[PDB]
Amino acid sequence: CILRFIACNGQTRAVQSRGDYQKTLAIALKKFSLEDASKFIVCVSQSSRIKLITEERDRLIIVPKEKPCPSFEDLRRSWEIE
Amino acid sequence: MTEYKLVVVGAGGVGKSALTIQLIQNHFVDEYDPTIEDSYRKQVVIDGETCLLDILDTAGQEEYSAMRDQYMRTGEGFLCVFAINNTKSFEDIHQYREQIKRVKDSDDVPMVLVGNKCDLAARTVESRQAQDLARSYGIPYIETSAKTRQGVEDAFYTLVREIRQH
Numbered sequence: 169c170i171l172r173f174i175a176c177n178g179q180t181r182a183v184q185s186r187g188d189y190q191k192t193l194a195i196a197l198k199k200f201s202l203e204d205a206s207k208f209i210v211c212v213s214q215s216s217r218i219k220l221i222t223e224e225r226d227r228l229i230i231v232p233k234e235k236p237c238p239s240f241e242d243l244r245r246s247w248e249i250e
Numbered sequence: 251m252t253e254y255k256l257v258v259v260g261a262g263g264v265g266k267s268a269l270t271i272q273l274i275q276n277h278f279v280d281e282y283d284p285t286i287e288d289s290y291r292k293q294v295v296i297d298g299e300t301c302l303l304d305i306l307d308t309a310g311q312e313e314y315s316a317m318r319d320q321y322m323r324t325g326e327g328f329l330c331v332f333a334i335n336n337t338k339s340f341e342d343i344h345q346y347r348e349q350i351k352r353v354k355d356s357d358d359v360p361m362v363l364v365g366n367k368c369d370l371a372a373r374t375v376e377s378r379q380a381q382d383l384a385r386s387y388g389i390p391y392i393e394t395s396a397k398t399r400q401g402v403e404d405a406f407y408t409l410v411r412e413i414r415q416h
C-alpha cells in the first residue's frame with residue numbers, strides 16, 4: 169500500500185499505491201525525475217537473480233525496460249534486510 | 251571516500267523537501283507534495299574533502315509517525331527545521347530534539363537548527379528566539395530560504411563540519 173522504489177543509484181522514494189501498477193510506476197518515476205512509464209520496468213533482487221516483477225515492498229528497483237540491470241548502488245541499496 | 255548520513259527533521263510544510271532538493275537538484279520546488287520518505291545523495295567537496303552525503307528526507311505528517319525510530323537510529327547528523335512564519339513548527343523543535351537524543355541515548359548528537367522561508371514578510375518567530383534556543387542546546391543556527399537559496403549550503407555543510415568535530 170506504501171511502496172519504496174530504488175533508482176538513480178543510492179536514491180529511494182516512497183509512494184502510496186492502490187494496486188494500479190502503471191499509475192504507481194508513473195508517480196514513482198516523477199519522484200525520481202524520469203519520463204514515461206513505458207521506458208521502465210520493476211525488478212526485485214532475489215538471492216541470485218534480478219527477477220522482473222510482473223504483477224503484485226521495502227525494495228523495488230526501477231530499471232529501464234530495454235536494459236533491465238540495476239546499478240551496483242541500486243543493488244547495494246537492497247542491503248536493507250529485516 | 252567518506253559517507254555522511256544526514257536526516258532532515260521538522261514539522262509539516264516547513265521546507266525540508268524544498269531545502270534538500272535545492273542543494274541537490276539546484277532549483278526551487280514551488281509545489282507542496284507531502285513527503286513519506288525520500289533519500290538523496292550527492293558527490294560533494296566540502297573543505298577540500300570529497301564526500302558522499304546520504305540525505306534522508308523525513309515525513310512531517312504525524313500520520314507517518316512510527317518510522318521515526320528506525321531512521322533516527324542510523325543517522326549521523328540532524329538538521330532541525332522550522333519555518334519562521336509558523337510558530338508551532340518552532341515550539342515543535344524541542345520535542346524533536348528530545349526524541350533524537352532519546353533513541354540515540356546521548357546528550358550530544360550533531361545537530362544544526364534551521365530557520366527556513368526567511369524570504370517571507372510574514373514573521374511570527376524572531377531570530378533571537380531561535381538564537382536563544384540554539385544556544386541553550388549548544389548548537390549553531392542558520393536562517394535559510396529555499397526560494398532565494400539563502401544559507402542553504404551553509405546549513406548542510408555546517409552539519410557535516412559538525413559531525414566531524416564530534
Ligand SMILES: Nc1nc2c(ncn2[C@@H]2O[C@H](COP(=O)(O)OP(=O)(O)NP(=O)(O)O)[C@@H](O)[C@H]2O)c(=O)[nH]1
Nearest residue numbers: 263264265266267268280281282285310367396397
Ligand atoms: N516562500 C517560501 N516557500 C517555501 C520555502 N520552502 C518551502 N516553501 C514552500 O512550502 C511548501 C512546502 O515545502 P516542502 O519543502 O514541501 O515542505 P516539507 O517540510 O517538505 N513538508 P512535508 O513534511 O510534508 O514533506 C512548498 O509549496 C514550497 O514551495 C521557502 O524557503 N520560502
Ligand SMILES: [Mg+2]
Nearest residue numbers: 266267285308
Ligand atoms: Mg519532507
